[PDB]
Ligand binder design. Structure first.
Ligand SMILES: COC1=C(OC)C(=O)C(CCCCCCCCCC[PH](c2ccccc2)(c2ccccc2)c2ccccc2)=C(C)C1=O
Ligand SMILES: Nc1ncnc2c1ncn2[C@@H]1O[C@H](COP(=O)(O)OP(=O)(O)NP(=O)(O)O)[C@@H](O)[C@H]1O
Ligand SMILES: Nc1ncnc2c1ncn2[C@@H]1O[C@H](COP(=O)(O)OP(=O)(O)NP(=O)(O)O)[C@@H](O)[C@H]1O
Ligand SMILES: [Co+2]
Ligand SMILES: [Co+2]
Ligand SMILES: [Co+2]
Ligand SMILES: [Co+2]
Ligand SMILES: [Mg+2]
Ligand SMILES: [Mg+2]
Lengths: 574, 599
């Protein structure tokens, strides 16, 4: 019944030949040009990153061999010639740099630069180059590429030129300004990148926080500081509100701001915002956008946060729009979860009222978090954020699991999840002679998934007599909608329900209790004989009023006409 | 003031040198090994794809008998993963040139048919993501050619020697690295095969047991697919346990190549944020959605040849293509659902029961008026001009409109009885336009966002009642002036009510448009007000209604009782208008009123 053909049957004879791995350069160029990036526009990102790196090298170079010039990135679109041009005033390239760096796929001069640096250096974390392929993204959109380059050394200017097809040319040129100018002659299906507004869209999308001024057709673009890199000390609330509206594409204010920077266990520069209004985070690296919707760095229940996470250390996929499977990323996610939880807890103690209102707006996310995480200490960490009412506190007052333990030789935390307080207080099960009252949606699924908190089990609780019994018997046969009617102040009756789950389901089998001492019931009894219509109308009205007061009839519209008929025929004797 | 440094200033001197592009092979190997694929498991996919290609080359070449299979073997004690195919194999120049050169693909040389998966020439090196050492035994079919053993580190060199006992085809053995030993466990490997290669055209055996690989039904002739085949395939792709209530098998060649199957489940939803995207029987990843968000209730599969694959085979390459495909699929699904509603209106009624919230969401969230109206073609309602229970559409409503009419009138109420006896419908009956009856909670928000349909403005009965004030409102009473309050009585009553409800209504008027109801609350933009409260009203009285005449008599006779009754009438109109706040505080007052009316 098993069919396997794999056996140790092979034996090498003769001798082995040795061979070095090779690489077909033309196919690699084609792969970068058509198969690497999900969108053509990304060539702009790559070229701008290169310009940034160039300027960064010059800044590094001016620390000792000091001297000169402005540090800028300039873009120019020519819609008539169909050209895109980028020029940086950076370190430039001599002929060996052009031949070696531009001419060799996967050779990165910026990688070699970074590897030679003292790790403490600024340039160590600002250089956005590793792979040695970004430049070839230009052939994604261009039939021809020309590069004019003038190195900062004292060296002629050069023109490098190619059509992307396995060969390029190098000649000497005048007069190249120090730095590098790249002219892309766009393909017919890419002329959109000779349009100014299109280019500006792309620049703001990926490179809006590049550390150097970016000019387009003589006008400056990137006026935004990357606030997540700066000392939390130096950010106004105004900086944060403007930055939040930009990064969240919003128009309100952040109600909470967490500016989290850490160097251990990994490099983290981030800002998280909780919006003011009632209901993602972008991933960056070295100030360049990776994902506008970071996918695996936060847990799914923290998707209500807005803002930015940047890490120098995150291993990037070759396309720079994905991350690589890594234990580092799961560690980062766990770290950020702990950090956000600690932040939220401390908010809840620094301002309990603001936190109450935060939890009323966003608690569904923490209920979901508790329900979905597998680790019990994480469930309890999140569960510290929950609020409830309690049998031992007035209505409206919020309390926590910690305070419930605080008011306990007692071993267990008893709870009752119900649509509202009236049904909870009249629960048969609320026969406890403290009970958490959990009125919020999905509360009971949350508490069941949580199981225990701080080692204590969360446990669910789950005038007369003439015709008291003919009055009541008449009512039993006239509303056969309730299963019992029994006799028990200001109200003539109330609706009571045995198990809260049934009421929950109904809102998506009740007991009626009557007060034989108040006037409308004595007169329901008195008009069971005298006037049967009026007694039926009054009966249905008392039932409906008890349903409303119990909170299980929130749209009384079906009753209104009947009520009017009751009223009209009750006032007919006036 | 502009600041631009870019000027046409540069010119060549002298002569040019010519150069060929080069490649740093060592770093390229490192990149394939650590930076190309976002997930290690895909090496299995790549190797299986290679085997499939080999078998295809054999299948093609022997159609001018041998077994054609892929075998996978896991050895958890030696930490080894082994794959062997019975395909064409490789001679020594194939091993040296094709395996030895990154981005060199022999499958390019093969072509010239649509079954070959490989195009990039790098998939093989995916093995070095998970393996310290790789060995390849290969025997080419073809012919008078010895067997070979190829072996390597991943580190810049590999070895080739002649070998005996090599079965025709290719066997690759991966010595897994220590933190990749998961791919030495059978259940993990089967997970990966099922995930990526469940539709491979050849049998795959794992440790001597054949894996249940599937036919790719979306590529096949729709008429040749039974309902049971669709039920089984639906259960697989949706990972479900019910059956599809609807099946749409959609193939197209223009404007794009499309092979797809969509299912609507029989069960009711629970899923508010779904279709798999494929190419050549190998899975791509939906991360980005190819359907609009309102169609996320669909299950199934989309395959399109026009979608370009990224080097890692987990992203797609032009998002304008994706928006075009999304619009095509949206159009096609709408057409399908409309045709379902006309071939079986009752089954469609239960579908619209169960899933209408998705179409409402689509209408509310889309920016384009033609798309809102396209989706709105799916909405169903009842009508004042149809028997209770019978459903109609916006298109049928406009088919019954008399030529001199400009607007589509609707009324939102909990059910048909409440709509039919609505005070607002009583006022609309005095006109003679059909009124749509909408029963679902978010119908009115939907219609407000839809605004117009087929060039006709959508107007609520409440709004129209308010507007008629500001026109010739030539409507007079159900009851002759004999059984009404006169003008003296009416305006004395009204003055009293203005003084008894001073900060609760903006004006109080008599209206001629009511019959059964004593009063109603009117607000110009009533739907928007209802919506707002779910986070200046006018009270209109029916001086022909008994409760109003007796309020008139009781302001004099019994002032306290008259105030209690007045506040009750106001509350009743607020409730009937869907503008009432929690009705619980009223109950005590109501009880008191009742007790004082029953003496
Ligand atoms: C316990 O764990 C938990 C879970 O399980 C994991 C959960 O799934 C969840 C959440 C899922 C429930 C249709 P709409 C609509 C739909 C999706 C988005 C937005 C809106 C609609 C919106 C509001 C109200 C009703 C319907 C619509 C919108 C406009 C017009 C018409 C309909 C929680 C909170 C949780 O806590
Ligand atoms: N504008 C520029 N000015 C100076 N040197 C440049 C410029 N653009 C590219 N270079 C050089 O050319 C090399 C190749 O660039 P590129 O192909 O983009 O790879 P990379 O920037 O090194 N790493 P990556 O961008 O992540 O692939 C760089 O490392 C630089 O040495
Ligand atoms: N099992 C095999 N049998 C025969 N030839 C094979 C086999 N595996 C690989 N080859 C050869 O080696 C080449 C390189 O394989 P590979 O690196 O996987 O790239 P590819 O399949 O051609 N394209 P891709 O899968 O998209 O990366 C193939 O084109 C074949 O010529
Ligand atoms: Co042996
Ligand atoms: Co160092
Ligand atoms: Co010139
Ligand atoms: Co007509
Ligand atoms: Mg670069
Ligand atoms: Mg391959």
């Amino acid at each position: 019944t098993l069919h396997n053909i794999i056996t140790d049957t092979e034996n090498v004879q003769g001798s082995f030949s040795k061979h070095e791995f090779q690489a077909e350069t033309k196919k690699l160029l084609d792969i970068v040009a058509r198969s690497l990036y999900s969108e053509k526009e990304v060539f702009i990102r790559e070229l701008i990153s290169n310009g940034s790196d160039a300027l960064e090298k010059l800044r590094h170079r001016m620390i000792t061999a000091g001297g000169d010039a402005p540090m800028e990135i300039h873009l120019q679109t020519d819609s008539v010639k169909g050209t895109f041009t980028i020029q940086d005033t950076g370190v430039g390239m001599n002929k060996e740099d052009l031949v070696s760096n531009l001419g060799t796929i996967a050779r990165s001069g910026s990688k070699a630069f970074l590897d030679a640096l003292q790790n403490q250096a600024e340039a160590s974390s600002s250089i956005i180059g590793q792979f040695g392929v970004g430049f070839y993204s230009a052939f994604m959109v261009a039939d021809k590429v020309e590069v004019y380059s003038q190195s900062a050394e004292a060296a002629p200017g050069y023109k490098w030129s190619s059509d992307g097809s396995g060969v390029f040319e190098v000649a000497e040129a005048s007069g190249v300004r120090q730095g590098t100018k790249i002219v892309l002659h766009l393909k017919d299906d890419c002329k959109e990148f000779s349009s100014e507004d299109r280019v500006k869209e792309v620049v703001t999308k990926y490179s809006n926080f590049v550390s150097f001024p970016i000019f387009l057709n003589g006008r400056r673009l990137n006026t935004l500081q990357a606030l997540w890199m700066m000392e939390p000390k130096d950010i106004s609330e105004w900086q944060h509100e403007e930055f939040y509206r930009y990064v969240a594409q919003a128009y309100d204010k952040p109600r909470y701001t967490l500016h989290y920077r850490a160097d251990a266990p990994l490099n983290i520069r981030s800002i998280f915002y909780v919006p003011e209004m009632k209901p993602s985070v972008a991933l960056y690296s070295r100030k360049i956008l990776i994902q506008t919707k970071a996918t695996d760095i936060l847990p799914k229940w923290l998707r209500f946060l807005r803002g930015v996470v940047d890490s120098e250390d995150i291993p990037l996929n070759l396309s720079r729009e994905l991350l690589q499977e890594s234990a580092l990323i799961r560690k980062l996610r766990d770290v950020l979860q702990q950090r956000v939880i600690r932040f939220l807890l401390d908010q809840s103690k620094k301002d309990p009222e603001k936190y109450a209102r935060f939890f009323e707006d966003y608690g569904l996310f923490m209920r979901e978090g508790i329900v979905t995480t597998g680790e019990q200490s994480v469930k309890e960490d999140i569960a510290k954020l929950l609020r409830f009412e309690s049998s031992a506190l007035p209505a409206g007052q919020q309390t926590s699991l910690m305070e419930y333990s605080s008011r306990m030789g007692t071993r267990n935390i008893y709870y009752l999840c119900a649509p509202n307080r009236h049904l909870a207080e009249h629960s048969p099960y609320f026969e406890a002679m403290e009970v958490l009252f959990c009125f919020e949606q999905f509360d009971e699924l949350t508490l069941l998934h949580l199981r225990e908190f701080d080692r204590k089990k969360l446990i669910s609780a789950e005038l007369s007599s003439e015709q008291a019994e003919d009055l009541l018997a008449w009512m039993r046969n006239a509303l056969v909608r309730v299963t019992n009617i029994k006799v028990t102040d200001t109200h003539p009756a109330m609706i009571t329900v045995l198990e809260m789950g049934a009421a929950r389901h109904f809102l998506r089998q009740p007991t009626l209790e009557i007060n034989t001492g108040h006037d409308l019931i004595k007169k329901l009894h008195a008009l069971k004989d005298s006037n049967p219509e009026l007694a039926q109308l009054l009966l249905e009205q008392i039932y409906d009023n008890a349903m409303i007061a119990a909170g299980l009839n929130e749209d009384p519209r079906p009753m209104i006409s009947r009520l009017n008929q009751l009223l009209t025929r009750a006032l007919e004797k006036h």
